Amino acid sequence: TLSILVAHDLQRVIGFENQLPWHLPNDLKHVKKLSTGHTLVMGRKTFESIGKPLPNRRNVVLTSDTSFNVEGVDVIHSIEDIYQLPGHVFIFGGQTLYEEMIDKVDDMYITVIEGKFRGDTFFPPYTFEDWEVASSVEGKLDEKNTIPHTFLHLIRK
Numbered sequence: 001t002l003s004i005l006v007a008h009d010l011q012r013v014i015g016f017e018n019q020l021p022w023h024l025p026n027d028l029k030h031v032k033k034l035s036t037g038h039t040l041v042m043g044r045k046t047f048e049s050i051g052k053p054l055p056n057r058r059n060v061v062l063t064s065d066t067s068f069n070v071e072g073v074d075v076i077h078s079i080e081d082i083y084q085l086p087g088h089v090f091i092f093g094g095q096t097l098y099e100e101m102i103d104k105v106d107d108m109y110i111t112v113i114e115g116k117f118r119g120d121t122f123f124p125p126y127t128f129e130d131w132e133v134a135s136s137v138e139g140k141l142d143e144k145n146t147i148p149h150t151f152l153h154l155i156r157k
């Protein structure tokens with residue numbers, strides 16, 4: 001299975017200057033629960049904003065750099081190598097990868113942040129006329145999670 005895993009706001013912002021615009025601990029639990037024991041595929045810039053691989057799952061980084069080597073990170077060099085990865089594979093970022101993958105994915109796991117942030121990175125446009133709502137669950141507000149957010153699981157028509 002090939003899925004997108006993404007958090008984006010009301011205008012589809014996903015990033016500002018190598019950072020997530022928002023601080024949402026609930027969405028990071030959701031990412032852990034969802035992708036533990038599986039594979040995360042990310043572009044080189046996404047990997048570098050994080051800085052280390054996330055424990056307890058395959059970290060796959062797409063890049064053209066033949067020197068690129070990091071402990072605990074497998075490297076791929078074309079979009080086509082993604083389809084050769086065994087298991088449940090989550091496209092984890094960033095903008096350019098989503099742009100390349102959005103038409104090919106089975107499945108989308110979207111956290112909609114009900115806010116409007118300044119950003120420089122965006123998730124590509126999409127219509128619900130292409131996606132069925134498998135589930136929509138409101139995240140719970142908090143001292144720690146202070147921004148409204150909804151977990152969507154969309155599957156392609």
Ligand SMILES: NC(=O)C1=CN([C@@H]2O[C@H](COP(=O)(O)OP(=O)(O)OC[C@H]3O[C@@H](n4cnc5c(N)ncnc54)[C@H](OP(=O)(O)O)[C@@H]3O)[C@@H](O)[C@H]2O)C=CC1
Pocket residue numbers: 007014015016017018019020042043044045046047049062063064065077078079092093094095096097100121
């Ligand atoms: N929520 C998120 O996922 C977050 C993402 N971002 C940001 O996304 C921003 C914009 O960069 P963006 O390009 O969208 O991010 P990516 O993470 O997708 O990194 C882009 C790089 O991925 C590699 N890549 C993508 N497609 C291919 C391909 N088909 N073949 C070979 N290599 C490929 C290239 O790496 P290379 O040049 O090494 O070959 C490319 O330059 C960055 O500033 C990053 O910080 C910021 C915060 C959060």
Ligand SMILES: COc1cc(-c2cc(C)cc(C)c2)cc([C@@H](C)C#Cc2c(C)nc(N)nc2N)c1
Pocket residue numbers: 005006007018019020027028029031032042046047049050054091092093109110111
């Ligand atoms: C700038 O710093 C970053 C840190 C992390 C990160 C670091 C640790 C230690 C754990 C976790 C779970 C995430 C991830 C990202 C980027 C790659 C992301 C993301 C993303 C999110 C947060 N939510 C959903 N739903 N999908 C997504 N693709 C950027």
